[model samples]
Target chain A: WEEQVFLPITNSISSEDNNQIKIGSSVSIEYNQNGQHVSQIDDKGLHNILVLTGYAIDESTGELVPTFDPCDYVKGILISGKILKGNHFKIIGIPSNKLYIIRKKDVHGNITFSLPIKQVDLRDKVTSFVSLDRDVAKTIVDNVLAKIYAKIYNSLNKEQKDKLYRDVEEIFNYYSIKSLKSN
Target chain B: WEEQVFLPITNSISSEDNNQIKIGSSVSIEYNQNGQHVSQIDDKGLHNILVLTGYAIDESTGELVPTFDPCDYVKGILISGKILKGNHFKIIGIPSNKLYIIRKKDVHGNITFSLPITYQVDLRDKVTSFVSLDRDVAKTIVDNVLAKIYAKIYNSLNKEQKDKLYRDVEEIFNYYSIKS
Candidate 1:
């Protein structure tokens, strides 16, 4: 009989965005801030990052359709710190399209702006191996989208009772946030 | 230039209750919810998760320690729509310690009791692995703690402020939600 390792009782592959956690492979290593490889597992055993588990998440899902449970297993350890990161993140392996969104916010948690995300191959750049799924490009897009949305939504209305008439309108019209023709 | 394949961007491993992200290990791997193997990469790729760079997390000096991004280079064709997973996570070729913490909450986010958490090898009881130090676990505490505080804080105010606060709080709490 073909044999495989049995999983534990408490683990799941969930994403704060769409179904991206189900994709991707498994590994453990350390990298730099530029998404560059720094250290790898060697015969002598040396690692820099650690992806631990546990937690309910900082914000209450309430009714977000794509809520993720931290107790579930994840693609890998994103980072380690108390106030710097979310519990864990899933690598949404969907391909990047014009629909892909990428942005950052200020300490006030407002989405200052957004830009189109382009998807490229990691293997060609780093691994120097072979081809990969176009969808894998969505890995970063998926994670970034969830975080930006979460921050913007949370900062605008901590109660989250504000009816979702249109954030783009309010953030742009009322707030200073605006969109310029990127094309 | 020495090269190999199959590493993880970010992974959490656990045996019983001990859970921790891979740190200074020979290698680490990301698995599915069922202890299934996912992709293995260097830490270079993790910036996608935090949208920034990470330094060696030094608890003592809190200095600018160096680390791989873990998110830059991926090994295999990352499966689409998969979620975070971890189970029976054991450290290989290294002396890995378990990091776990007590997470008492309505595990379902419905509001329940909370617990303390530790960090180590055994991450989750069954399926998952390591997690944020205090965010999620503290969220459990916050629900009860903050909820009560808000309740009392709300009661002390007048009707105008009370209603305003309720609306504001509701909006803030559910910013991720949408209206019908």
Candidate 2:
């Protein structure tokens, strides 16, 4: 039998060995519209996971989750070449990871935010007012940027993260200003 | 109420009315993966409309339009307005009313064709490579293009729509050559 080499998942993984990090109890299924652990039932109380949180994999027992939000549990576990906090993410290695979050906002908001933000005068970043096809490209770029932002937010110190966000926003604003002028 | 002004149930009920103008023998259907009709359904179907190809409005009788291609029908109408098609517009309405199908062929083609030809390029016009959001906007703007490209497309091909289509491409290429 050939031994299989495993690849590290870019985002969160379903493999038990890969997901050793967990969130802190403070971060428990906190009523997020797009958060984990969503159980729905009818007039009768049937149960299933609509949303789910991160959990640890015990190789010994082959059990699903021995703990939830293992922030305290994973204080020192080396998770996938990086540190983990009980099946949740820690702020240390996010600066260099690639992640994808499949959360979708309201469809209307998606449509509106995606609409052209080009100033009326057409004097700024000529790219702001998209025709149709360009808007799609803009969104792809946005998703890339969002991943970068999540990394920064998750890793940096609160102050550094704020600064990073401000810097990115500044760069965006510079283009926005330029766009307004062009308009 | 002195006089209730209800839009004539013909073409005045909603702007959406003018927007979804079906052309030829049409049947509304849900577009599916293989481009086949999943079901004969539409925003308004089986209930009140069997739209015909005239100004008169009756939700009961007309030819069935199987598919909805907004631009195909707009080419035959007499109206104009705009809902922003994504930032990337494949078909740019050139100076004359003819259309120039502008897909991102390559970096070089984009530089030569798009950069110089457009009045202005807005940030929203930027695409990853050259894809843009459409479906919904296409549903609406394709419903109406009173804004820019429609006039540009129509006006460009005043003498002959077909002749102008071929002519415009060659002409634009010629213009590029002369400039560079």
Candidate 3:
């Protein structure tokens, strides 16, 4: 069989000029006082705003739901850096919605409001493409969500713990049927 | 609590005119015969390329280990789509090393080919950032970290106390699966 390709529409840049990532172009990144991304001007001079992966903290359901709305006023860390056409710098391909969730965290490490992200180095200046599966995404969300809730769990008194268990069990009950029906 | 921030060293744009994502900037993407990415030109007029998350597919360890190298050739999946600007299109971002393994295949869908991607979608016509975790590596890391923390809580807690701790963790894990 001829090698088949999968150019699944991974990008979210909705535009007419959205088809290409040309050279000699510039990219602007917005930052807060703490140096986070407010907005970024993409190569095609578009606003690269941050959107939530729809994973939200539902106090009512106590479950994260897939939200397709963009996150408002997300302070982008490492907010400023250029696609400098330099010796050591290189602009890789145009990326699309690469959803992510924080995974592991060091209890003693500096508190990072964002997810667990590590450095990615490339060769030939670059090569563009990335894909993930559902299994890994679940593990990542689990790790991150656990850390986020652990604080609340640790601080709760006995009564609060009991209430939490009830709330969670109810949530579990609601979801069990949902899964069963979907299956 | 004030939101804490950590600016991990992300993004590798080696360009002469590297800056921020601005409007009116031009981007160039290369395509293979199969309409897949071959080389891309970022706004900075550079060969903006792709790289694995600085890890190698080490069959020996059966895990993706940090190897300070790049995967030879990779084909990206449209996977999904989006809308932005006033134009009904999507922004492609610079994806991190999300080494994927096709567990199951549905021939009912479509098929295409080619590797060596360059640009993702972005503003004005830009792309976003994406990262992935190696399956085995993720499990190993999870197992190791959980064990480490459990040990910290050990030696002083009774069996029942430990059981409570485990139950809490199991609930979280269960939540994860249910989320799946």
Candidate 4:
């Protein structure tokens, strides 16, 4: 029912502002090419900015590492900190993490690599939220239903079994009629 | 939760030896081409045979009508009654329905239509059995899980909520790791 999952924790960023970066501060990150720091404009001609959300614990070593919150992690894009045409920055939520990363794409369309950041604990806010493929959902449901049915059926008496069967039949009959009518 | 569904109950067949057909009996049914009884062989050179399973009730009329059981209904193909090479018949499980249909493909490859049969009660043997598409099952599970989460979350106190959240987080983390 529960599982431990590994998620991306670090991003590559320009080394220029690494000294001034703080837990709650907004920082500019650019593509790191070999030893060169460069920035590229998106199709909309805007600079991409990212906010640090929270700190994660390094698994190998016991150190606190900065990481993006569940929101940005799930969105795969920054909800805040987009630089517009007027050089006006769209600031939203304050960064809660101690560290973060930024990356850029080169003209050749290659993306910069993400640096290593510690893994963070899962947040509760994402409890029932997931975008799963239809095929995966079907597999889960069918398997779950089969187990449930076996458990229930094994616990029933002959009379109860007959009743259950009759109920299922009625349900199927009703749905079939409805489906045919709709079609 | 259970839902009510309607299923097909009757099939079109040739109008000969209707009285001779009974439950557990193997019957030959042909496509009725404009009131003309006709039998056609499949591409594999075989005649279709159907077995009658059991009886059902006519919902509106309150009469006993023969109907195919769940197995045949789901399979949509007769497991038994395949006439193979050398005119030898392939026999399998006896038909559980009191009545069944065998249709023929015309030279134009048009199939005959099905007739009206009464509705039957659901069988428990089919519990948890269904052929659902991936999309449909996903919808069902997502909706069910959402409801469950909401109900569980609403009933918990602050302390309990926090614990639940952390638990969910761990579960998600594990899955994420596995998923990734």
Candidate 5:
């Protein structure tokens, strides 16, 4: 059975443009009850409306982006009597800001510690989040990619390995964008 | 205040590497009476032992991988005598396999649906999963990066918002590896 997944457009899309929302984007229906707007779920228990009013800015680049609190979104949906099981909704889009973990280092041979931010990427395959069958897709893609990387790692020289790692990083970035477009 | 967090490595590292384990990784100690290998909780209630024996595989490549079952791991920890609040443990390695959802499409005029495979990534910042002050860290990181990403959202909920979705939020948080 085919299920409809909504891919909401971020403010990255210009509002004045004719294509404010992409072609495949789902439209939100007007709900008169309590004068609040909501989406309807189809008979197949899919196609629920998504309401994303808030937007956030990228910390590094200072651009406007969408708020992605899936936990709250799922809760809000449930309160409205809509059940969002696994694979019901797929998240697309990468925020401009990078996530960092604070590290403490003792400098100057003193007992003082310095807090520095270290960047890390989401380890899972970028495409897995948007897959219609997420579990199956993740299993296939993550394993294949890892094995390929490992196999290539074994076959390459030190310089080549470093270059391959750099290339892989770029691939992940592209994968995030590609996954968004896939939906 | 310094909050201690545990990092458990997978079997990818050898048992006898002596440096079998990395220097920064946390160790699991022996627990008496229960006949289990459990770690101790310090006065700060920060240290906690993690038991992750189950392993999965790289579905496409065919290699052994640790099961990244954070949901079940959290649930199991809660059932034990210990209480695992947020930031108690950090998940450090990549699993061999991927996670997927199924899809179907109608073809030819006969109305036959074909299922296809697609891949995706975790949306949040990976390092945020290991932060000590998680709520504080999540709020700061999620918003900063979202703002930085364009900018971000959460936790600053009103009374009505919190009350309406308390139970549901709890489950969601747990699933995402955030223990209340």
Candidate 6:
């Protein structure tokens, strides 16, 4: 018969079997109420694009879940936006790659920390509200940066895996900022 | 020893002052739902006028009760109004009484509170009188109390005696209805 377009929002899928990649059908993926997350599935509306996380698909439940080590710290999109004062969210995504869900806090006291990927992106390399050890920081950066340059990664063959890892460093070196303390 | 104004709405008392009223005075009034006449007493504020009914004083109980004769067609004003509803009010005689509590159901079945009574002119005249036996009303009141009356007064008397009591009551109602 025909194949279904299985695309996710992040670079969490394993690189071992490239056969799972759908060369065609690239689906772009992208809550409510006061102090609650209201679930709405957009299957056939303006936002009906399949942007997935690297989480392995549980065939029985059909839910995406974290499947690998790099995905352990990678809960989901960690991009920041203008935070408001309620539990509302807006999601934007690049199909089969990066997806960011921006959420608002009613009041900031008890917070369940999501990976501050932007602050994780800055790490010690830039002055920001959050920081971590360089090694810990790179995993987040590498996994996340993979989506920032998703088209380049998807087109690269298996022979370019090592080059892709090296280029991860290159992109960080070229783009990482100096400390604000220096300025 | 002295008089007291016993106010009731749909049928609840609103206020009392032992000194302003009688040490020897007591009154009893009541009502029910198909409309309303719930009884309660008040502590403060306006609507503190004592509207009364003509009932006999049960000296032993030191309270008023339904007398044997005239009170037959009587029901407390299971009602209220923007103006005075009837005679037989238990007034303390203090005028300009803020009577906010007097509520009456309009024909539309909505309720409206009355203006306070600053002046209470006794509108009753001498003769034919406002007293009516109202047999139509008697049917309603008797029918309502029949089951209860049977349970209460029935066993207390014999069939002939009970029959006599009903005939007497019927006579009173007939008398009241005929005059009205």
Off by over 4 Å in 1: A1-92, A98-183, B1-147, B174-180
Model 5: per-residue Cα lDDT over A10-100, one tens digit each: 2221111221222112222111122111222221221222222222222122122222111111001101111121222222221212211
lDDT tens string, model 2, B1-180? 010001111111113243332221221111111221111112221111111111111222211111111111101111222212112111121111111222211111110001101221122211111112233433333234211223333344434443333332222211000000
Model 2 CAPRI quality: incorrect
Among all candidates shown, the one with the greatest TM-score:
5
Tens-digit lDDT track of model 6 for B1-180? 122223222111221221111112243322111222221111111112222222223222223332112222222222221112222323221212212123222212112221111111111121112243444444433334322323344445556654553443344322111110
When 1 and 3 are scored with DockQ, the better candidate is 3
On lDDT, the leading prediction is: 6
All DockQ scores? 0.01, 0.01, 0.02, 0.01, 0.05, 0.01
Put down candidate 3 lDDT per residue, B1-180, tens digits, no spaces. 111011011111111122111111122112121222222112121121222232222221112222111222111122111111112211122112222212222212221211111112111132212334334433442233222322333435666654443343232221000000
Q: After superposing candidate 2 on the true structure, give the runs of residues whose Cα lies further than 4 Å from its correct spot.
A: A1-155, A171-183, B1-24, B27-180
Clashes of each: 158, 68, 96, 34, 50, 19
Tens-digit per-residue lDDT, A1-183, candidate 2: 011111111111222222222222211111122222212212222122111112222222211221112120110101112212222222211111111111212111100000001102111122211111333323322332223233323444555544433432322210001223421
Segments in model 6 whose C-alpha atoms lie over 4 Å from true places:
A1-183, B1-117, B122-140, B146-150, B155-159, B173-180
**lDDT at position B92, candidate 4:** 18
State residue A165's C-alpha deviation in candidate 1, in Å. 47
Q: What is the C-alpha interface RMSD of model 4?
A: 30.0
Query: Candidate 5 residues B1-180, lDDT tens each?
Result: 011122222211112221121211223211112212122222122112222221222212212222212212211111111112111222221121221101111111111010001223233332212212235433432233211211111244444443333232222222112111
RMSD (Cα, Å) for all candidates, in order, is 25.8, 23.3, 27.1, 31.3, 25.7, 32.1
Off by over 4 Å in 3: A1-82, A85-95, A99-183, B1-152, B173-180
lDDT of 4 by residue, B103-180 (tens): 323322112222222111222222212222233333332233212223333334354444443343222211000000
Q: Give per-model TM-scores.
A: 0.16, 0.17, 0.19, 0.16, 0.21, 0.17
* Cα error, candidate 5, residue B2 (Å): 10
DockQ of candidate 5 is 0.05
Candidate 3: residue A27 lDDT (0-100) = 20
lDDT (Cα, tens digit) per residue for candidate 3, span A32-132? 22222322222121122222221222222222222111221111111222222211122222122222211211112111122111112111112112222
